[PDB]
């Protein structure tokens, strides 16, 4: 096969998240100690900062 | 009739590792040591040639 063709490994899309054509990433939390929207409110934080 | 014929070829030494350990992105190839606390810290290499 190498005398008609190349073979290279590379690095690349798993899967297209295609929210509203919009491609997109998850990020999945799981906080069960604490109360929801005070985890959020310092995710907004935390996030808006660093 | 017909005859398979399997041939085995040394080469010349180099550091050999089980292929399974051999991480690549295609841009760059690593491996996982193992430290000597248990530590796992993993380290860059430069491939040769793998068979079998």
Redesign the interface.
Known sequence: LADVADIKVSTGPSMLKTENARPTSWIYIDARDRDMVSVVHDLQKAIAEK | MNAWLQLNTASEPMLLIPSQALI????EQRVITVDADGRFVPKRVAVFQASQ
């Open positions: 690549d992105t295609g841009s």
